[PDB]
Every structure is written in structure tokens, then in C-alpha cells.
RNA sequence: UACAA
RNA sequence: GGAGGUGACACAUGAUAUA
RNA sequence: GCAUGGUUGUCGUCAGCUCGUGUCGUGAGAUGUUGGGUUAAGUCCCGCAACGAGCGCAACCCUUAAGCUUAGUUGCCAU
RNA sequence: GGCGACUUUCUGGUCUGUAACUGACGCUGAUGUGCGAAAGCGUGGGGAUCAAACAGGAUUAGAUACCCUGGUAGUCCACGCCGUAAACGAUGAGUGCUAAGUGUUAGGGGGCCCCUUAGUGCUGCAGCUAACGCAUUAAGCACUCCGCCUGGGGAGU
RNA sequence: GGGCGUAAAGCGCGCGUAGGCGGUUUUUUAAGUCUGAUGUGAAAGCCCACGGCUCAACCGUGGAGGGUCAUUGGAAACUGGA
């Protein structure tokens, strides 16, 4: 859980956390103490609308089959980073993680 | 362009307002009916009358009046409905029996909402504000949808136009949907203003 | 609570296969006159509906404006794009010497005494954004004393 | 629409 | 997938503002 | 009818046209509504900063093509 | 500006490494002085191809064009002149500083890879921008010097 | 207290004169720079204060200001000179 992505794509901000690059296992352990489907656009920023679908899911079969299945993560961070913890590989941006775990 | 929502549904999911049968006196009875409907509109113009139903049988005319304000039609002690019944028996020379049916929630009745808007427009009220208030009231009372439209020289403009508002669903192509519709006219200093209201209850 | 002021109402158009489709853009500044100001925009076919959207959006980006006895701590120029607003502390007797949308932003912030000049684009949205930029970069003496590791007296 | 031809 | 290089019969016209 | 209400024709039964919230953009705007297939159809599925909704499509209405029950006159006629 | 068969002769500049040497001898540069595609001009040669002009044939309402058949200057050489181009990266020169990734040209160092110079491309942060975009080959951050701009037309008259 | 990729604006490009600008340190100087002294910058005016006009204009009185000024004594970091 400490072998990151290839060198030809490693973000420069993971140099402290980092052939291929190997993660900082020693630093992740100290960081770990400090700390499945598509993410709908506006899951957090549009709860005034999603909750209606969440409520309508609780309350047709064609909708529910996709609704149950529903209710890489750049959409989610913006929904949270704009509101003012997560595994952060070398290719991922660390500057936008409050509790970054530098483990693969 | 758009068919009258009532006329499309008459005899399908909406009932006739005239319930009688005739063959050779059809024209004479039809125009006695229209004579009565014009009389009631004029004589009860302030009594919030939504619609009038006429039934005929055995030289008797049974008239049902659906009114928002039934106490004005009946009058204190039944005196106002006795006076109207006496005048109807003179326009007709038949035995008229009048029934009055209160319509609660006058804000869900297209005819009453349309005429209220027309009355406010004649008082120089904002053609936008009256439409938005009527829509908010109907939707608060559980209307599935409502549409309003005022057409003409809005605010005394030299060029007439139509401003319409809507809320909810008003499925004018769905035949089984009971859509209440009414048109009313406001007499302003600048001419005719047309008010159309569509209400969908569910 | 928050007072709001309608800075500018603009009717905008987009062209379609028919004629033109019109909407209304409202630029609104909100503020409490106690050091918190914010601006927002909203668009609608109706002017009042665009104002409410603009008011609601303004509340999400309130800014904290440092003040000293009703005036700014130092001179600053706020710049956003082509907009640029020069703001200077003035004596308590002086009023808000500002021209347009700057006056709305500074008043709703609670300034009442400032010397400001708009040096740049007079487009209201960018003038407003420039004004907020300059207020966003003001620093009070207690804050800069903390970063430099001295006390406030040693700053002078 | 008011014009022009 | 997106760029940069490379190569690849005939059909005239429609006054001014206001839109 | 170039001051209007109401009513109608036409593009044209063309499948499109929008809105709310969110998000992107200084902004006009955009997105959704595009993309891969599919359909008479913005019809449907999948993917997607969109999620939903509305007016449209369709379906609910009339009639025509088959059968059954009720009914047998003024309809029908096999014994 | 430009430069493309090969050979010889004459000759300019750049790059890498080294750290012998000199010891700020540098940068920029008004005026000035030179070089400067193509067309063009003069003198004299040359003349295959192509081809302004021009001729004929088509097309067309007309066709002083586009298309076809020819064809002169010119296109080529030498020596003079001319001094202009979207002469463009539409980006003046010098110096330093500021994430990365990935091709390619000429080298160097070390163990095909790693490091490093100098060019030449693409992508892409911070920053900048009106946006488009630029982004260690800046349009970023700075200092020095030069050239230039101040609404459009009139008029580069 | 602005600009020059596409809005007006980088000379087509070299070489180079005057000029402008110029790496590190030590000593020295004192032209620039800084800091006092003296003289002068008339009066009226402007600004502040006070007084006379019934108030005010206005008038008067006392200050302040205005030099890239000169002469003279100090300082030596920076620019200049050795
Ligand atoms: Mg249908
Ligand atoms: Mg070389
Ligand atoms: Mg030079
Ligand atoms: Mg020159
Ligand atoms: Mg030539
Ligand atoms: Mg030819
Ligand atoms: Mg020749
Ligand atoms: Mg020659
Ligand atoms: Mg140029
Ligand atoms: Mg430069
Ligand atoms: Mg540089
Ligand atoms: Mg780039
Ligand atoms: Mg390079
Ligand atoms: Mg300018
Ligand atoms: Mg420049
Ligand atoms: Mg141009
Ligand atoms: Mg230009
Ligand atoms: Mg150049
Ligand atoms: Mg030129
Ligand atoms: Mg006086």
C-alpha cells in the first residue's frame, strides 16, 4: 500500500510524501493517526434537490433500480472544498486535502 | 391555436351544464335557457357565481347555482332567493325551483379566480401582481397546477401583449385530466383586457 | 440583519430562431454596516425574482473588513480585471467620497469615512469585484504584529 | 406604420 | 480524441427611418 | 385588426422549447438539452456537474378490424 | 533576408569540456554605416521550362476573368541600382529569478539507464490576460538601454 | 499615474559613434545625498489668529508659507571622482 504511480506522471507536490515512486510508509503511519458508484453532481451542494430524490427513493421500479445503485472524485472535493481526510496518491493533489494520507 | 380546455372535455369527462331533452322545441328551450343564464349573470354579478346548471322536466325548471358566496344569493332568511325565483317565473312562465350550492375554496375555481383578477385590473392593480397572488393562493390550497394569462394593453401600453404565469403541471393534452378553465374581461380606460385561468386539481 | 442595495439592473438578450429572449440580471450588495459585506448576482425574466437570487447569492461570500474607528487601516488599491479602485483612510468628519457601486460596497461595510477613486473600468460588476478585492487585502496592526513576532508598539 | 418609386 | 506539417456547366439583384 | 378582447390561418404533428436548484464563466452565456447506441418521437438505455421538473411526444378520448355476456323489437329466419 | 546533388579551394559563426591567461575590458544604442525575399531598372550574355502583357478558343445577359491552345518581358548568369513585403513568433536587445511531464538535435559526466550543458517542439502549475491564450524558448516576477502609440476617415495623402 | 501577440503601437535585420546604464571588496574624496548656522526670498495677496466696519463683503494688525537661492560648519551608507 506504498507503491505509487509511475514517475512520468507523479505530481511535484508529493515529493515529501515520495522506476516508479514508493510512498512514505513511515510518514503515513504518523498521518493515519491524525486522520462505489458514480458521484452525482451536486450531491452535497444541491441537497435541496437530491434529498427529494432521496425521499422519493424511500417512497417506479425502473427509477428505483438506478436510484438504489446511485443513492476520480474531483466532483466531490469541489462540493466540499467550496464548503470550507482521504488517501492521496502521488498523482493526486495534496494541497486540497485537510487530512492527507500519503499511502498508495 | 389552443382549443378551449372545457370544450374538448365536454361529454368525455365533463358533464353538460344543460340537462334536458327535446326534439321540436329544442330551439325554443335552448333560448329560454340562454335567457335565464343571462338574467342570473346580471342579477347576481356580485354574488361570486361560478356556473349555473339547468334541468328541465314536466313544465318545471330546476336551476342549480354554484356560488362562492351563498349567503348573498340566498339572502338573510331566504328572502333574496325568493325574489330571484319570482323574477325567473316571469321570464319563463314555468315553475322554476332554485338550488344553491356553496363552493368552498374559491381560489381553486377558475371562473372566480379569473373574475377576481379582472375586477382588480379594473382598479388599476398590477397585471403582474394579481396573477402571481392568484397562483400562490391556489397552489397553497393543493392545486396540482395553475396557469394565468392577461392579454391586452397591460398598464396602458400602446402595444398590446400577453403576460402569463404558471406553477405546477397543467397537462392540456391529457384528456382525462380535469382542467378548470375560464376567461374574463376587464373594462379599463384603454379597452379590453383578457384574463384566462387554467386550474388543475387532480 | 443584512441590508441590501440593488446596484444595477440589466436586461440581457439571447437570440433564438424566433426573435429575442430577454432576462434580467440583478447585481446586489449586501451588508450589515458592521464590517461584513458581500455581493451576488441573479438572473430571471422578472426583475424582483432576479434581485432575490442576487441577494441570496451575496450572503455566501461575505467578507470581513478590518476597520479602525470607522476608517480603513491603510491605503490600498483593489484590482479585478479591468476594474481598479483606490481607497484611502479619511478623517472621521469626512464622508464616503466614492462614485458609484463603490459607495454601496463601502457603506454596507460600515465605512462612513473614506477617500476612494475608481481608476479603471466603470462596469459595475468589475468595479464591485475590485472594491471587494481591496478590502480583502487590508491588514490590521494586530494581525501583522502577530506575523512579524513583535508587539503592536514595536511596529512603530 | 410613415415614407420613397 | 485533440493539435501542428503534407498532399487533394451555370446561380445577378433586392430603396429610408422605424423592428 | 398598426390601440384591443375573443376567435382563426401558417411554419407544422416539426420534435422540439423551457424552467428551478446546483455547478462553470469577470460577463453575455453554458450545462442539463451534449456523447455511444435506438426510436415516428428530447422514445428509451448507458455514460456524463448535473439532479429534477414543466410545456411538447406517447398514453388516456372517438371510430374501424375479432370474440364473449346481457337484451330480442320495429332487427334476424336454421329447424 | 535566407541556405538542400556531389568535389575541391578560400572563409564566418555557434556549441561542449577545461580553468592557462587578462582582470569589468560589459549592456544598449539617437545620429551613422551596412546587409536585405520577390517584383522592377541599366549594361551585357543566355533562353530549356514556366509565364504578366498579348492573340486565338471557350463560358456568360455581358466575361477586358476564372478554363483551354499559344506566347513576349521576365524567370537564369555577371556587374551596378532599387531598399520594399502578412521582411510574422504580427512578440526589440541584455541580465537574473520562478512547479512539473514528455519528444527531438549537438555534446559532456557516471553507473541501456541516471545526472548535466546548449538548441528545438508539445503539454501543463503559480502568475499574468479583456478574452483568446502565454507559461524556464513568458505574454510571469524584476533592473538597464533603444524604437514606437495616443479615436476613425482625410492619409502614409 | 498608461501602453505596444491579436485593440493604435517592436525599426526587416546587423555593426557601431555620442549618450544612458553598469559585478565584488578595501582605502580616500566630498560633486550628488543628508544635517545644522547665517543672509536673503519687498509690500500687497493666499492660509491661521485677533481687531474695526450694526453683520458680511471689505479694511487693519501679528504670524505662517513659498528657493532647483547663496555662503558656511558637520556626516559618510548610497551615486559620482581618485
Ligand atoms: Mg398522443
Ligand atoms: Mg560548433
Ligand atoms: Mg549593441
Ligand atoms: Mg537607427
Ligand atoms: Mg529578381
Ligand atoms: Mg495561359
Ligand atoms: Mg534581366
Ligand atoms: Mg544582383
Ligand atoms: Mg510592425
Ligand atoms: Mg525581454
Ligand atoms: Mg527573461
Ligand atoms: Mg501552455
Ligand atoms: Mg529546453
Ligand atoms: Mg490607454
Ligand atoms: Mg515591450
Ligand atoms: Mg488589424
Ligand atoms: Mg495592431
Ligand atoms: Mg522584429
Ligand atoms: Mg516593413
Ligand atoms: Mg466688513
From Swiss-Prot, chain A:
An example Gene Ontology cellular component term from the record? cytosolic small ribosomal subunit
Give the GO terms filed under biological process for this record.
translation
Record's keyword terms, sorted: Ribonucleoprotein, Ribosomal protein
Q: Does the keyword Ribosomal protein apply?
A: yes
Q: Which domain of life is it from?
A: Bacteria
Question: GO: which molecular function terms?
Answer: structural constituent of ribosome
Name the family the entry cites: Belongs to the universal ribosomal protein uS2 family.
Protein's name in the database: Small ribosomal subunit protein uS2
Species, as recorded: Staphylococcus aureus (strain USA300)
Q: Which gene name belongs to this protein?
A: rpsB
UniProtKB/Swiss-Prot annotation, chain B:
Q: Which GO terms describe its molecular function?
A: mRNA binding; rRNA binding; structural constituent of ribosome
Give a GO cellular-component term.
cytosolic small ribosomal subunit
Q: Name the UniProt key words of this record, in alphabetical order.
A: Ribonucleoprotein, Ribosomal protein, RNA-binding, rRNA-binding
- Indicate the segments forming the KH type-2 domain, all copies: 36-104
One example of a Gene Ontology biological process annotation = translation
> Which superkingdom, per the lineage?
Bacteria
- A Pfam family for this UniProt protein? Ribosomal_S3_C
Under the heading CDD domains, the entry gives:
KH-II_30S_S3
Q: InterPro entries under this entry?
A: KH_dom (IPR004087), KH_dom-like_a/b (IPR015946), KH_dom_type_2 (IPR004044), KH_sf_prok-type (IPR009019), Ribosomal_S3_C_sf (IPR036419), Ribosomal_uS3_bac-typ (IPR005704), Ribosomal_uS3_C (IPR001351), Ribosomal_uS3_CS (IPR018280)
The record's comment on protein family reads: Belongs to the universal ribosomal protein uS3 family.
**Subunit note:** Part of the 30S ribosomal subunit. Forms a tight complex with proteins S10 and S14.
Q: Which NCBIfam families match?
A: rpsC_bact (TIGR01009)
Relate the protein's function as given in its record: Binds the lower part of the 30S subunit head. Binds mRNA in the 70S ribosome, positioning it for translation.
The protein depicted here goes by the name: Small ribosomal subunit protein uS3
Species name: Staphylococcus aureus (strain USA300)
From Swiss-Prot, chain C:
Q: Which GO terms describe its molecular function?
A: rRNA binding; structural constituent of ribosome
Matching entries from Pfam families are given as: Ribosomal_S5, Ribosomal_S5_C
Per the record, the GO terms for biological process are: translation
**Which segments constitute the S5 DRBM domain?**
2-65
Specify the superkingdom: Bacteria
Q: Which GO terms describe its cellular component?
A: small ribosomal subunit
Q: Which UniProt keywords apply?
A: Ribonucleoprotein, Ribosomal protein, RNA-binding, rRNA-binding
What InterPro entries does this protein map onto? Ribosomal_Su5_D2-typ_SF (IPR020568), Ribosomal_uS5 (IPR000851), Ribosomal_uS5_bac-type (IPR005712), Ribosomal_uS5_C (IPR005324), Ribosomal_uS5_N (IPR013810), Ribosomal_uS5_N_CS (IPR018192), Ribsml_uS5_D2-typ_fold_subgr (IPR014721)
Domain commentary: The N-terminal domain interacts with the head of the 30S subunit; the C-terminal domain interacts with the body and contacts protein S4. The interaction surface between S4 and S5 is involved in control of translational fidelity.
Summary of subunit composition and partner proteins:
Part of the 30S ribosomal subunit. Contacts proteins S4 and S8.
Give the family per the record: Belongs to the universal ribosomal protein uS5 family.
Function comment? With S4 and S12 plays an important role in translational accuracy. Located at the back of the 30S subunit body where it stabilizes the conformation of the head with respect to the body.
The name of this protein is Small ribosomal subunit protein uS5
Species of origin reads: Staphylococcus aureus (strain USA300)
Amino acid at each position: 500500500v506504498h507503491f505509487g504511480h509511475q514517475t512520468r506522471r507523479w505530481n511535484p507536490k508529493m515529493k515529501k510524501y515520495i522506476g516508479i515512486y514508493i510512498i512514505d510508509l513511515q510518514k503515513t503511519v504518523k498521518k493515519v493517526d491524525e486522520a462505489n458508484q458514480r458521484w452525482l453532481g451536486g450531491l452535497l451542494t444541491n441537497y435541496k434537490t437530491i434529498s427529494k430524490r432521496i425521499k422519493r427513493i424511500s417512497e417506479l421500479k425502473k427509477e428505483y433500480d438506478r436510484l438504489i445503485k446511485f443513492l476520480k472524485e474531483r466532483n466531490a472535493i469541489a462540493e466540499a472544498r467550496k464548503l470550507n481526510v482521504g488517501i492521496v496518491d502521488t498523482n493526486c493533489d495534496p494541497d486540497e486535502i485537510d487530512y492527507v494520507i500519503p499511502a498508495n | 391555436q389552443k382549443i378551449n380546455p372545457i370544450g374538448l372535455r365536454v361529454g368525455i369527462i365533463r358533464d353538460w351544464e344543460a340537462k334536458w331533452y327535446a326534439e321540436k322545441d329544442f330551439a325554443s328551450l335552448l333560448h329560454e335557457d340562454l335567457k335565464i343564464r343571462k338574467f342570473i349573470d346580471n342579477e347576481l354579478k356580485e354574488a361570486s357565481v361560478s356556473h349555473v346548471e339547468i334541468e328541465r322536466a314536466a313544465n318545471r325548471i330546476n336551476i342549480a347555482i354554484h356560488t362562492g358566496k351563498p349567503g348573498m344569493v340566498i339572502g338573510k332568511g331566504g328572502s333574496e332567493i325568493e325574489k330571484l325565483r319570482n323574477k325567473l317565473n316571469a321570464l319563463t312562465d314555468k315553475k322554476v325551483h332554485i338550488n344553491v350550492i356553496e363552493i368552498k375554496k374559491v381560489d381553486l375555481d377558475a371562473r372566480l379566480v379569473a373574475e377576481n383578477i379582472a375586477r382588480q385590473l379594473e382598479n388599476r392593480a398590477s397585471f403582474r401582481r394579481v396573477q402571481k397572488q392568484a397562483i400562490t393562493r391556489a397552489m397553497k390550497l393543493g392545486a396540482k397546477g395553475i396557469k394565468t394569462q392577461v392579454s391586452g394593453r397591460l398598464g396602458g401600453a400602446d402595444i398590446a401583449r400577453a403576460e402569463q404565469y404558471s406553477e405546477g403541471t397543467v397537462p392540456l393534452h391529457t384528456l382525462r385530466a380535469d382542467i378548470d378553465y375560464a376567461h374574463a374581461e376587464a373594462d379599463t380606460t384603454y379597452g379590453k383586457l383578457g384574463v384566462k385561468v387554467w386550474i388543475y386539481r387532480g | 440583519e443584512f441590508e441590501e442595495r440593488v446596484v444595477t439592473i440589466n436586461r440581457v438578450a439571447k437570440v433564438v430562431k424566433g426573435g429575442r429572449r430577454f432576462r434580467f440580471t440583478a447585481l446586489v450588495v449586501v451588508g450589515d454596516k458592521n464590517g461584513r459585506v458581500g455581493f451576488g448576482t441573479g438572473k430571471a425574466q422578472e426583475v424582483p425574482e432576479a434581485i432575490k437570487k442576487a441577494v441570496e447569492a451575496a450572503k455566501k461570500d461575505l467578507v470581513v473588513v478590518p476597520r479602525v474607528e470607522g476608517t480603513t487601516p491603510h491605503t490600498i488599491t483593489g484590482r479585478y480585471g479591468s476594474g481598479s479602485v483606490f481607497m484611502k483612510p479619511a478623517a472621521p468628519g469626512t464622508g464616503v467620497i466614492a462614485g458609484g457601486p463603490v459607495r454601496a460596497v463601502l457603506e454596507l461595510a460600515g465605512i462612513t469615512d473614506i477617500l476612494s477613486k475608481s481608476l479603471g473600468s466603470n462596469t459595475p460588476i468589475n468595479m464591485v469585484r475590485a472594491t471587494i478585492d481591496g478590502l480583502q487585502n487590508l491588514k490590521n496592526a494586530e494581525d501583522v504584529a502577530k506575523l512579524r513576532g513583535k508587539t503592536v508598539e514595536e511596529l512603530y
